[PDB]
Amino acid sequence: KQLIEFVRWSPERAQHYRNKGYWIDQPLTRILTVGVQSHPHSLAIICGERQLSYIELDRLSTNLATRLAEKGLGKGDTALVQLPNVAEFYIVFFALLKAGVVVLNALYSHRQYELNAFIKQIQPKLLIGSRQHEVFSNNQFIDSLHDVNLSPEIILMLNHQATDFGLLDWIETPAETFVDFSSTPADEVAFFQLSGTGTPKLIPRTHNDYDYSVRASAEICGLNSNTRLLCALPAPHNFMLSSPGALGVLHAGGCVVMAPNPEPLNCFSIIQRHQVNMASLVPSAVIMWLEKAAQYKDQIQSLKLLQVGGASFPESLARQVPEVLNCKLQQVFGMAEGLVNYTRLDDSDEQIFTTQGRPISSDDEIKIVDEQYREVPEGEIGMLATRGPYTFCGYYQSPEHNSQVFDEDNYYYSGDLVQRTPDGNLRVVGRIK
Numbered sequence: 001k002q003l004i005e006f007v008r009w010s011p012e013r014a015q016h017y018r019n020k021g022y023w024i025d026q027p028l029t030r031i032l033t034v035g036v037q038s039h040p041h042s043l044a045i046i047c048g049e050r051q052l053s054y055i056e057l058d059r060l061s062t063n064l065a066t067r068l069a070e071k072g073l074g075k076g077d078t079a080l081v082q083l084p085n086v087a088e089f090y091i092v093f094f095a096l097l098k099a100g101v102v103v104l105n106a107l108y109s110h111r112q113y114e115l116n117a118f119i120k121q122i123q124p125k126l127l128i129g130s131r132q133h134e135v136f137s138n139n140q141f142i143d144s145l146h147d148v149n150l151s152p153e154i155i156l157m158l159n160h161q162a163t164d165f166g167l168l169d170w171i172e173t174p175a176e177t178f179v180d181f182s183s184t185p186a187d188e189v190a191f192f193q194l195s196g197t198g199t200p201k202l203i204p205r206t207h208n209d210y211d212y213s214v215r216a217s218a219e220i221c222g223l224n225s226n227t228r229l230l231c232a233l234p235a236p237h238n239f240m241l242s243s244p245g246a247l248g249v250l251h252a253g254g255c256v257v258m259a260p261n262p263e264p265l266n267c268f269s270i271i272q273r274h275q276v277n278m279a280s281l282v283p284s285a286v287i288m289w290l291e292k293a294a295q296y297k298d299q300i301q302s303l304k305l306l307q308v309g310g311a312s313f314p315e316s317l318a319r320q321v322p323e324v325l326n327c328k329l330q331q332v333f334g335m336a337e338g339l340v341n342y343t344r345l346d347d348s349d350e351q352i353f354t355t356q357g358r359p360i361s362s363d364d365e366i367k368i369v370d371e372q373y374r375e376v377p378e379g380e381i382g383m384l385a386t387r388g389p390y391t392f393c394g395y396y397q398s399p400e401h402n403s404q405v406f407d408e409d410n411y412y413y414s415g416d417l418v419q420r421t422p423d424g425n426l427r428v429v430g431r432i433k
């Protein structure tokens, strides 16, 4: 009966964030609802040969939601979802948001070891996966869950076997009866994000905070109804999902275009076929694209904006993006825990090629501290500490850790080493363990 527990912002910060218009107290489903009202038939997702309009995405996720509610899944319940980069990922996500089921999206590259840890932490009553995944190749994993009383009441499978509950069956046809359902409240948990090294920690994200990061990111990256965003990174990743990600593109009324991964030749033909004009990558993938871009120039001419985040992205490599990939560059330094930094579209070249940008919000607060947690002199290198309208206040059910990474003012210490540049942007120089 209880809603999932999580650490709240102080009432004072929550009020401030409402006052500024960051938190508008709407569910994440807002994105679909509004899209359906404005442009029901414009494309929301392109996946292989499939094309899903906004109203289709809306109907299909409502269908699955009704089926889950009919089975008694809802508020206070959790779910574990593990799907590849396919349209069903978003249908399921919006379905669970609609039903008020708090979902953890595992990476498709996660294995039974991680899945096991996730299941023990959130005890899902719903598990959705794919038979084509190693862990669900057989029933060894599922069975082993019964041997510990951690079996989900419901298990849906993509690429299902005849004796499976077929994910597409539950999506394609509504329930026989009508049970009532609705999203969890806007300042309560919507879903779990995952930290990015020894088994991902769970980051509760509320509707308010996530929708805000999405809406504000979309504005920063100039998304609009003509945006076609390649989704070649894992769909569940905070970067690919919200920065600005698929949610940001849907917020702006554009279209997400799926790819299994960042493999250059496949991505290039997808980009060409659908005239993709935006993409998001990590440096190792940018390098793969650079190796082939000269020869396949014609195929990627439609790219207008490439976001790059993660790892290390030296200036000399960054300059190759507009030079070889023939599109604008935007650097992104963010974290599933909250804070995201973007270079702005009207930043100087120097800023874009040598910094990782600046926070989404004027109310993203940042401390850069020395070994004694004193703020360093302006411009020096220090440890990042941060808080804001979309940065979390603690990991799920982890009081000991939380106390280790938050200070008395609820600043989060990400471990990143950073310096502020004179222009105002941030440069990430390393990481502290």
Ligand SMILES: O=C(c1ccccc1)c1ccc(-c2cc(C(=O)O)c3cnn(Cc4ccncc4)c3n2)cc1
Residues within 6 Å of the ligand: 107, 109, 196, 233, 234, 237, 238, 239, 243, 282, 308, 309, 310, 311, 332, 333, 334, 335, 336, 340
């Ligand atoms: O494509 C993947 C991936 C992840 C797991 C399995 C397979 C692929 C992927 C995608 C993004 C990152 C990744 C890693 C870092 C980092 O500091 O280590 C990082 C820092 N900023 N960003 C951009 C970012 C933006 C928003 N939220 C979080 C991160 C990063 N993205 C790392 C990996």
Ligand SMILES: [Ca+2]
Residues within 6 Å of the ligand: 051, 052, 053, 056
């Ligand atoms: Ca269609």
Ligand SMILES: [Ca+2]
Residues within 6 Å of the ligand: 300, 301, 302, 303, 304, 325, 326, 327
């Ligand atoms: Ca171009």
Ligand SMILES: [Ca+2]
Residues within 6 Å of the ligand: 322, 323, 324, 325, 326
């Ligand atoms: Ca060029």
Ligand SMILES: [Ca+2]
Residues within 6 Å of the ligand: 196, 335, 414, 415, 416
């Ligand atoms: Ca970190």
